[PDB]
Design a protein around this ligand. Structure first.
Ligand SMILES: O=P(O)(O)O[C@H]1[C@H](OP(=O)(O)O)[C@@H](OP(=O)(O)O)[C@H](OP(=O)(O)O)[C@@H](OP(=O)(O)O)[C@H]1OP(=O)(O)O
Ligand SMILES: [Zn+2]
Length: 417
């Protein structure tokens, strides 16, 4: 039930977000085999919910009355996200008690494998008594059936806004994806080495070859959006951070890593693998449902921000000295902001697609599979949504400032024709 210090050596680094560090199990305890632990970080940037947050998530009491942030995250996924996405592809993760010594031991144990800039920003919140055990989807099913290749995509937002509330100078937000605009700021802030080739509009397009174009793009410039695992081990993409362009060195390493799984002449494993991922993505149409959650951002931050200030009962700084939104009932305003924060979740979650050579000996042969015509292989696949985090209400402020920043910088750069 409780993870003590000694257990620390059994977990190895897997990756990290901005708010969570993730370790994969390595020991042999039946409880944790094929599981990962998601540990919340203590940001120096920043009870379980603010006074305003209880007001918003009011319709969902199991949420507002949570003991810790771990159960809060659990109940959010379970009570808000599942009903929207389906329980087939989402698991909320079992909670577990952890000791302060365990956490402190883990933090120091992994410090060396972490990106420096990540360490600068946060460590594990050693005040928490809890943590989350999820399944290790770099392993196919629970408990085996031969090697497993899995891909983790962070697709980000795949639609263009359409809001009335987009200002006059900012109307370029209508044409260009937020992702592409944001790339110019990251590159400006020395957050990435070169602009990524990826355009989420291709991935979400519902078009077969635009999906392939996206997967190819992802492979070329993975940054923080593309990872590939072999039996849990990272074989492509950055570890808890963005990575540089796929060089011929990296490309080759990955090309080697795929031996046997994709059954093709040496050198052609990579392009066939990409085809496979593209086919599963498109076939499953699992993106369509996600994009729907995303499109719950009906009004865009420039619209929704006005509602936020009505929620937190403060004079809206964004209107100086719109009738439309500020005349809405409190009820309607809460809906808008809630759904914005849900969309937010959806825009930052990641997909895991686990592959495995079709096992003819299954008790119930899977519904979902991809036939690889050229290599004569059939692969079974599963899709799962991960990193489904509740976004904190106060963030509404920083969302607006950030967006304003992106769109001004993009306009600024364009004005140099
Ligand atoms: O720290 P990074 O890996 O560069 O990614 C951050 C981070 O996403 P993670 O959840 O993956 O860390 C932010 O979330 P927090 O961890 O700070 O909660 C998220 O912001 P929101 O999820 O609040 O939108 C932001 O995404 P965005 O840039 O869309 O705000 C995103 O940055 P990138 O995904 O652009 O790298
Ligand atoms: Zn306003």
């Amino acid at each position: 039930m409780i993870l003590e210090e000694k257990d620390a050596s059994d977990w190895i680094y897997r990756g990290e977000g901005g708010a969570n560090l993730v370790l994969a199990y390595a020991g042999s305890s039946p409880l944790f085999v094929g599981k990962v632990i998601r540990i919340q970080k203590a940001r120096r940037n920043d009870s379980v919910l603010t006074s305003d947050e209880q007001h918003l998530w009011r319709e969902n009491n199991e949420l507002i009355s949570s003991p810790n942030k771990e159960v809060l995250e659990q109940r959010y996924v379970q009570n808000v996200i599942i009903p929207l996405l389906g329980p087939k592809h989402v698991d909320a993760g079992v909670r577990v008690s952890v000791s302060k010594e365990f956490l402190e031991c883990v933090d120091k144990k992994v410090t060396k494998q972490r990106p420096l800039w990540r360490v600068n920003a946060a460590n594990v919140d050693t005040s928490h008594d809890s943590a989350l055990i999820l399944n290790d989807h770099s392993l196919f099913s629970q408990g085996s059936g031969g090697d497993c290749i899995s891909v983790e995509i962070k697709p980000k937002c795949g639609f263009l806004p359409t809001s009335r509330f987009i200002g006059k100078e900012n109307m370029l937000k209508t044409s260009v994806s937020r992702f592409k605009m944001h790339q110019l700021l990251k590159l400006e802030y020395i957050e990435i080495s070169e602009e990524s080739e990826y355009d989420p509009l291709d991935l979400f397009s519902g078009s077969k070859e635009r999906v392939l174009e996206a997967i190819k793009a992802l492979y070329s410039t993975p940054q923080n959006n593309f990872r590939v695992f072999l039996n849990g081990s990272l074989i492509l993409g950055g570890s808890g951070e963005s990575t540089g362009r796929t060089s011929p060195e990296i490309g080759y390493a990955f090309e080697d890593a795929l031996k046997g799984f994709i059954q093709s002449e040496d050198g052609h494993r990579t392009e066939c693998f990409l085809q496979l991922v593209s086919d599963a993505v498109y076939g499953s149409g699992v993106l369509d449902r996600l994009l729907e959650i995303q499109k719950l951002d009906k009004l865009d931050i420039e619209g929704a921000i006005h509602c936020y200030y009505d929620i937190i009962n403060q004079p809206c700084p964004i209107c100086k000295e719109e009738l439309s939104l500020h005349a809405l009932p409190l009820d309607e305003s809460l809906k808008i902001v809630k759904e914005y924060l849900i969309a937010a979740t959806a825009k930052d979650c990641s997909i895991m697609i686990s592959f495995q050579s079709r096992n003819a000996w299954d008790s119930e042969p899977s519904g979902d599979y991809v036939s690889l015509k050229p290599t004569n292989q059939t692969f079974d696949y599963k899709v799962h949504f991960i990193d489904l985090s509740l976004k904190p209400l106060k963030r509404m402020e920083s969302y607006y400032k950030l967006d304003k920043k992106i769109i001004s910088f993009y306009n600024r750069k364009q004005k140099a024709e």
